[PDB]
Amino acid sequence: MNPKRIRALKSGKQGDGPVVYWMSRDQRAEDNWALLFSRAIAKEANVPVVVVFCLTDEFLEAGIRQYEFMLKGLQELEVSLSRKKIPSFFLRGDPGEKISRFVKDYNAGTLVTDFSPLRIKNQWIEKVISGISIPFFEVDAHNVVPCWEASQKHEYAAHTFRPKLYALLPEFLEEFPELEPNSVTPETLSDVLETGVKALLPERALLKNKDPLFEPWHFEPGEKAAKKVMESFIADRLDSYGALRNDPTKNMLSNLSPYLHFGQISSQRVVLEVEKAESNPGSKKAFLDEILIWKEISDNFCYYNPGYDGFESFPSWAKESLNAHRNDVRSHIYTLEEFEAGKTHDPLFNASQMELLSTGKMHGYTRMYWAKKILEWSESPEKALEIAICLNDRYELDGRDPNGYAGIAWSIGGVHDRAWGEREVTGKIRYMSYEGCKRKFDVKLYIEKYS
Ligand SMILES: Cc1cc2nc3c(=O)[nH]c(=O)nc-3n(C[C@H](O)[C@H](O)[C@H](O)COP(=O)(O)OP(=O)(O)OC[C@H]3O[C@@H](n4cnc5c(N)ncnc54)[C@H](O)[C@@H]3O)c2cc1C
Which amino acids does the record list as binding FAD 1 (predicted)? Predict the structure, then answer.
């Protein structure tokens, strides 16, 4: 139990009641350092640990697709926590009011949360801090190396983050102890879900048909399903991962991101299991570079760049280049709605958007293509960011995520990239031509599937 995984958010005066884990990003009972640390604090204080989760007011900014995925996972999590004699409380409202009142009503001794560098989580933390008098910690349960330990600063390139992260893997890549049950046992989510779906229904994504776009059978939610997705990746897809990760016609990615986003599975767990797997070495190297380096550099980016969703966080070479080309005439301009409906003149863009609409998980390779075309066919880089973020967060099951803001910033602003050949409109931002994709994979086949 490495104390570098835990950080103080606010000093206070310990109470004598239960330890409260305010669960937010890591919605799982296994392999969860935030829950493990909370249990350990509780054991030392001779009190139970309890879990609280806030069903916030912001759910109406995404769709049923994410809400159902999350809540069905939480239904399973209730069962799992209760088998460990750990009660769970689902508070309807936003954390400032609800966590502060829970702490008071339940005489909590200590408050622990998990770690997210996103602005909304920090907004919540500030409001909670002002409503409590007990000590308040956070634990990095999402990264193998705690974000504030991996580097002291924003890293401008994967090649400067990678050696720092790997220098720390021998220390921090380690097995998880079993979660000790509590010593004794100290509105349903279904009804919550029904109420939420009712509120979301008018904005559900539909065909002109009125038939719903989303297909909810591609990724079944919850901890158990996540483990099966991990196991089938290692058994059936990891060998081919190195060769096929950039081919969106093949179903050869891990498909773990929706689970990783909600923390229904630990990336540290996935890494442990992949490390021990015997597969082609280039495949393992490639996969670990995505789930370790690119995933954790995305937390690095959001943690150290308050303006991570804005033009100002782009590297200076990219800001200067995009500025130099700000007044270039765009070959096309599309509205948010035209992008959203897949109604551009580019059939590969449209098919990428259709994959997002129907499955909630656009292939990683075409996400790069897609965001770069939003840059190319919008009035400014600032507008491009807004559109890409809006669509990514509204329709990706894995959205509203540091990987999203960092991936969009990479695509549009060259964050964690270098200058390439100068073009009009897009300046030196890496370009991803349609023709280049055709040389790379069977574009026609991808278009046929998603049209
Ligand atoms: C414009 C754009 C937007 C993106 N938005 C998101 C988002 O909202 N949420 C999200 O989780 N990922 C996002 N990504 C990163 C990446 O596209 C997805 O993580 C990946 O496609 C998810 O599929 P998978 O789990 O099957 O991937 P795999 O290839 O199996 O990768 C395994 C895991 O590694 C991590 N990973 C892989 N690629 C990246 C990457 N480029 N950056 C960061 N972490 C990575 C993810 O945790 C992923 O689940 C975005 C990328 C771009 C270019």
Answer: 241, 254-257, 290, 361, 367, 392, 398, 403
What CATH number is given to the structural domain containing 340?
A: 1.10.579.10
List of residues 6+ apart from 132 with CB closer than 8 A? 10, 12, 99, 100, 103, 111
CA 275 to each of CA 182, 284, 313: distance values in angstroms, whole numbers, following the listed order: 32, 8, 34
Q: Which atom of ligand 1 has the smallest separation from the CA of 295?
A: 44
Q: What CATH number is associated with residue 280?
A: 1.25.40.80
Task: Give the Å distance between the CA of 419 and the centre of ligand 1.
Answer: 22
Task: Give ∠ CA 131-44-52 in degrees, rounded to 5.
Answer: 40
The DSSP output letter for 424 is T
Binding-site residue positions for FAD: 241, 254-257, 290, 361, 367, 392, 398, 403
For ligand 1, the distance from its centroid to the CA atom of residue 257, given in whole angstroms, is 6
Q: Does ligand 1 come within 6 angstroms of the Cβ of 291?
A: yes
Handedness of CA 128, 139, 110, 53 (dihedral sign): positive
Answer for the pair 398, 364: CB distance below 8 angstroms, yes or no. Answer: no
Q: How many domains does the chain have?
A: 3
Q: Copy the structure tokens of residue 265.
A: 């599975």
Ligand 1 center from residue 52 Cα (angstroms) = 28
Mutation probe of ligand 1 site: the residue of 25, 260, 290 with most atoms within 8 A of C-beta? 290
Length of the chain: 451
Q: What is the DSSP string of 118-153?
A: SHHHHHHHHHHHHT--S-EEEE--SSSS-HHHH-SS
| 202 & 249 share domain | yes
Ligand 1 centroid to residue 410 C-alpha, Å: 12
Same domain, 371 and 401: yes
| Method for structure elucidation | X-ray
328 is written with which tokens?
Answer: 């270039």
Identify the bridge partners of residue 91 per DSSP, sorted by sequence position.
54
**Protein residue with least CA distance to atom 34, ligand 1:** 291
Q: Is 292 exposed, middle or buried (0-12, 13-18, 19+ CB in 10 A)?
A: buried
Q: Are strands 88-92 and 110-114 parallel, antiparallel or unpaired?
A: unpaired
CA distances from 121 to 36, 38, 56, 259, 399 (A): 21, 19, 11, 19, 15
